[PDB]
Amino acid sequence: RDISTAVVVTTISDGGFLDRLAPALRDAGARLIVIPDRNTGPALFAACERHRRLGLDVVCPSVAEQQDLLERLAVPDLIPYHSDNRRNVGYLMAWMEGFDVIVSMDDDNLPTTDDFVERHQVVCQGPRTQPVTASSDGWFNNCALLEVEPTEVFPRGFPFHARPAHAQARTSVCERPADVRINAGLWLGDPDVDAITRLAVRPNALAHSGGSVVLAEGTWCPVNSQNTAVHRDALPAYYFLRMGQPVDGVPMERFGDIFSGYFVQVCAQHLGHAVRFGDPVVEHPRNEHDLLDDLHKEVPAVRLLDDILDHLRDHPLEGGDYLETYESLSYALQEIAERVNGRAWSPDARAFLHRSAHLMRSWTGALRTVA
Amino acid sequence: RDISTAVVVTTISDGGFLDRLAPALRDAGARLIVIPDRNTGPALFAACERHRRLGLDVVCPSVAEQQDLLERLAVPDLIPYHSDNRRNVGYLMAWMEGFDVIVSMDDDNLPTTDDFVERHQVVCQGPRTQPVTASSDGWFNNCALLEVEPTEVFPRGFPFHARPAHAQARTSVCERPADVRINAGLWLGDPDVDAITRLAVRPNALAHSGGSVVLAEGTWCPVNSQNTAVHRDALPAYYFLRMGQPVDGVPMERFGDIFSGYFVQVCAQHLGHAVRFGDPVVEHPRNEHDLLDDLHKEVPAVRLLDDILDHLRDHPLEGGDYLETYESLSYALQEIAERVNGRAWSPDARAFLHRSAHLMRSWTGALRTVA
Amino acid sequence: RDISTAVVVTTISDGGFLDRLAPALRDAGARLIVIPDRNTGPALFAACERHRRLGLDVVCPSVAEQQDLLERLAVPDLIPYHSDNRRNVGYLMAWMEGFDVIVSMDDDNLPTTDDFVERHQVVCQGPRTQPVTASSDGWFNNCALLEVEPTEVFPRGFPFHARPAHAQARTSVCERPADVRINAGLWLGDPDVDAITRLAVRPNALAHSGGSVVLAEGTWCPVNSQNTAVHRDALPAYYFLRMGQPVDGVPMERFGDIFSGYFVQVCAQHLGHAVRFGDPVVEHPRNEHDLLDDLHKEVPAVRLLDDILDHLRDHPLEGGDYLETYESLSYALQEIAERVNGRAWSPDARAFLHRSAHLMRSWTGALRTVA
Amino acid sequence: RDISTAVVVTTISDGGFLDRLAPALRDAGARLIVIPDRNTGPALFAACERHRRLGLDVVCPSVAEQQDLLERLAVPDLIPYHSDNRRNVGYLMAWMEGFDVIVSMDDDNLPTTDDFVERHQVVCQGPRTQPVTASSDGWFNNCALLEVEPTEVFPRGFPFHARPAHAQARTSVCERPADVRINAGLWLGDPDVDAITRLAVRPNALAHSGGSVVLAEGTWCPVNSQNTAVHRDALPAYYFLRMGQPVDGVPMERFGDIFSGYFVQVCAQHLGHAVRFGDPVVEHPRNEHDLLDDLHKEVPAVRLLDDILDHLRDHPLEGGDYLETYESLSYALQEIAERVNGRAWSPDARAFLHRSAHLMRSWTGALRTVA
Ligand SMILES: Nc1nc2c(ncn2[C@@H]2O[C@H](COP(=O)(O)OP(=O)(O)O)[C@@H](O)[C@H]2O)c(=O)[nH]1
Ligand SMILES: Nc1nc2c(ncn2[C@@H]2O[C@H](COP(=O)(O)OP(=O)(O)O)[C@@H](O)[C@H]2O)c(=O)[nH]1
Ligand SMILES: Nc1nc2c(ncn2[C@@H]2O[C@H](COP(=O)(O)OP(=O)(O)O)[C@@H](O)[C@H]2O)c(=O)[nH]1
Ligand SMILES: Nc1nc2c(ncn2[C@@H]2O[C@H](COP(=O)(O)OP(=O)(O)O)[C@@H](O)[C@H]2O)c(=O)[nH]1
């Protein structure tokens, strides 16, 4: 096979998560690209070298090295600091170094099986006729593949308009050609639900009981960047979107991977590729964060996501590869920003899509400079 | 007994809800005070007279009559228009006319039993040793008295900080003297949950299985104005709080009765009175409203309610009656507005408590002019 | 000569300004394009019909005829209603009809001479060696051509950073080739100063004493749309910028023509064309408006204008005509939106330039459709 | 006479202003109370110690000694840090220590004469029949007492609605009893104009030519805290108002002394006391700051000041001293906050007056504690 894998993780911690994460990555020979920030102490760099002495191919480029690379690519102001958006640096580096599979992870996620890297390499198997899962409402709930207490939940980024009628939706499985390029692994413990769901029922993912699915064309499901493998061809469309844009005066946050998960998904289906949900599963322990502050950060994006996803189905895309398709998607979002109507579509909400459109083309422009 | 009852309802509808609501009120001889607004058509007034010809003691004062009364009480700018805050006009009128019990209802609530008015008259029974319900965490979940699908929920206004540990709280029932002055009836169908809960699980109240409870001193539970009887002595502390105050730039709404339900509750316990939860139960059908807009309106209040309720337990109150105690509460909230700290306590959030403090004293001042 | 002139005016008034504006336009055979809005009464349409019978070639398309034209050009949402941005409709119509000169006016401006149209036809003279005016600081104060009391003033849109040192700048006149394509006529009575200047000194323009000037390459001066002729080739770059974008939460207004005046000016100098200031002079009487409300709307623009103009001098442009150069300018504004730094450059301020750039391309896309 | 004078200055500088300020204060035996902040370096404390050995009675309480004093007075959250509002600490300290005259100054002001302290002692002369200056429009322009180029200006805080017609107002001088308690010394160089005036004309005060005046009852003029003596009886009404309250989402600043100057002025005239303008004159050199940032902070104040001053003329006050009259003023401001109407009076603008009224009473409550 000779499939190369690079794991991208951004962090501002001391690096203690490497003690449990390294054995799963060192046995498979995959590279771990750790992207620190300006608010990251020197304990992380000392923890990376010690794990490298144990055999782990871990790279931790300092802030000066990251900024020097971004300035050499004419994008010095694209990726901000004091933000998890810096994982785009790891996406770029892993793509420059020619890795076949790029696995995006959070520093608080831990693999639960010994074949974590092997299962994520499913995005490099190629096209073949395989069981594909379709839904009559065009949406699939990946949380239905898990055993969740005390009630059924939806993943973060799932549109709220389609939730009440999703119970009556018909799910079909058919043998059809498909080419998996994005594999979204599931999570045990604290699932990836929005702040609205975590505040209401505080869900707990007990086990992974539904297996794995490959979504057919027209059936969507949000993809995060906490346990997701992306084939190197689809990485140009996996740019982690810049947050902070105000919606009716409230700065938007915590949805950078919601847009990127949908953007790489609509580009993949335009090119005849599919998204996979299921294994490998990680353990996401419950972190102690102000859930009311998470809600305050997620509401601005939630008010717009339903309309954005609705117009993306009506808008056809152009392109022969992910670079051309992602740039065609950026201009599509600018037409949507002026066509959409609603109470939450203030001038700053519309301009959010326009600024995001420029940053996405600035991302693709940087990838075209190295290539 | 000779107990007089007045039902206060504000509406902007055509008055079609009177066809089913009048029989429950006409048989008991209670008065129905309907408060229209400027955005209310002339069909409501024609529907009130026809139901009055059938025997219902229904009063529907026009906007000109309401404003003339408020200007005669030196409060012309207290109650705004195009808002459900106009139910304060019904509170004032029912209190001026000397009614013993004032039942606050929404126009979309319908009694389910033939003893609706009789059960709400429990607030005029007087003090007596009776089973009182206490909780080790100081909070009672009235939704636990209902059969709810698909999972357990909390009422709108219940603090989020105490929800995770509320399952391990110990509930006790003891024989203690108590004087019920506020009776919060429950609701079937769509329960009174916040927008966070309704978006996540979309609860459905099937039946009322837990009976009725009287909360002891120190055990709180939010009280709404959709199906709640208030003894005429406690009405001065039941002022429906003015909404629209921005919190970090976002106008607050949909929590006018959350503050009033807590304010009349903390005043009642200071004076040795209690709040009752249970019967009579009404049917609240599910209305078709933008749940994401409700969330946008409720988040500003939700970010502050936990801290406000926390400081109210530390702040002692003064007063011999509800007028003195409510005014003492207003000054207490101004001290809290400067002592509280947090990320959501911007200058406009603190000033919200100060403006609310003036409006509450303006409400008590109006009641002292008629009295 | 056989020069066709079209005057573009948008208004919501009754049309009384036609009585004093028609004689100067009817004696010259020019067309007046009146663009009404939704808040325009039916008395304006009757005013245009009477002056039509008096010999004035005046057209007044209803809002239904405006939206029909804008929809056929795939720009139904470009131009908003209840806004003076609707003068773009007159710009478009006059450009489709093939008029050589387009004179942009406000409805409260009145010509003071008989040769009003003849003087504005200077934009159709062609290139010739003529005295051009240059300034050592790169800025020219057109209000210095007027007699203003009680003190010297700068026009609306003049950068504030260059004002204190402008008195020390040297003004030189040289014989150089120039092609006048924009002619900004001056104004007596209430000059076109910003709300800051009008609140401080309330200037009064008494006379036009400085004659007329043609600015050399590198010397700029703001151009408004109240008394300005534009050659039809330069009209594609004269799109009246859409207002309402928030800057730190404050929506901007009253500066749509400030950007359009600078945008058509930087495009003209790139193509070797020049801007003229001086005659014909109009009379702008002191209007009736709250100056503090004008200030509240102009401050968000003023906070960004100096930085935008500074970066436009460094950013080179491309293009062979005004359509290509304007589109090149739009992409230049998006790069400036990410390189600029300052306390006023919040995320919404940067996104303002990105949304404006899309609307500029939407304007050029509509012109390329009729072409 | 045996008149004790205390000069109050808050600063974050190194203390170099002490070299040119001490001689005028040391030769008069006055005390200088320097109030540092958290962002004040250790070089200031060494500067006060050297001038202490040179004979200057200068005190410089550390932020630990400030918070200890403010906590014992039950006002630990009244005065914020990183703000020039900390000059209230100097007002409090000088009042506790029993000084007769309190001179409020900024650290960038320098006396121009030897009798600086002696002239400020005019607030301790007592009542006497003296020439008082009245104006037919109820406003006096103290900048008319100075020689200002290039044109006439109004002081910061002067209402904008009264400026255009002020030139037509009649100024009369009459022999009437008056008791000067506030003396606002004038300023040369950069006068105390608002950011609107400084941006438009950049005034320069060349000389003090108009002498000094004492304003009659009904004639007002804004008083700042940069060069102003306050009799100790009037200090309770001279509380420097806390800034930062949003007006339509924009936080206000730079107007803390504008309100305090008007508040102590309306309280003084209610008690039969007068305000004086003129000598002693200081030199305020042109500072180094972004004028557009000053404008951004002053506009929210300017939008409300005219309406606040208009209602203060109609609202009568009560009280026998400055403590009672200031508290009566605070409740008067809350009634104005609900009666006032206008486009700038959003809910947060009204709540600004309510929170300010509580802080005013918190200030008076602390003074009644030490008393
Ligand atoms: N570069 C960078 N990464 C961050 C920062 N904050 C968080 N992250 C990363 O973003 C991911 C999400 O973190 P967070 O939202 O705090 O997770 P939580 O603790 O479960 O709430 C984590 O895996 C972090 O490694 C930051 O300031 N800079
Ligand atoms: N006076 C007045 N009352 C209102 C207005 N809007 C709603 N209400 C009342 O407030 C209550 C709450 O209404 P609403 O929030 O719309 O209930 P929903 O339909 O279930 O969402 C209703 O019983 C209405 O009678 C209004 O504009 N003016
Ligand atoms: N279509 C349209 N035009 C407007 C509107 N308001 C103003 N205008 C036009 O825009 C120009 C500017 O007017 P205005 O803003 O009132 O200038 P002012 O004198 O400074 O107040 C006028 O000539 C009006 O004809 C509007 O709501 N719609
Ligand atoms: N305690 C404190 N005082 C300040 C601070 N900033 C300014 N001051 C004082 O407030 C006065 C006003 O200064 P400033 O706002 O810079 O005036 P400017 O010349 O118009 O810029 C000065 O005399 C300073 O000593 C601060 O952060 N803390």
Author numbering:
A (entry chain B), B (entry chain B), C (entry chain A), D (entry chain A): 4 to 374
Paper text:
The initial structure of MtdL at 2.1-Å resolution was determined using single-wavelength anomalous diffraction phasing from cocrystals of selenomethionine (SeMet) derivative MtdL with GDP. However, the electron density of the GDP diphosphate moiety was poor. Then, the complex structure of MtdL bound to Mn2+ and GDP at 2.1-Å resolution was obtained by cocrystallizing MtdL containing 0.5 mM MnCl2 with GDP, which led to a clear electron density for both the GDP diphosphate moiety and the Mn2+ ion at the active site. Both SeMet-MtdL·GDP and MtdL·Mn2+·GDP structures contain two protein chains per asymmetric unit (ASU) that can be superimposed with root-mean-square deviations (RMSDs) of 0.079 A˚ and 0.081 A˚ over 308 and 353 Cα atoms, respectively. A tetramer as a dimer of dimers was suggested by PISA for crystal structures of both GDP·SeMet-MtdL belonging to space group C2 and GDP·Mn2+·MtdL belonging to space group C2221.
The MtdL subunit is divided into three regions: the N-terminal region (residues 1–111), the core region (residues 112–291), and the C-terminal region (residues 292–376). The characteristic DXD motif (Asp109-Asp110-Asp111), together with conserved His287, coordinates a Mn2+ ion, which stabilizes the diphosphate of the nucleotide.
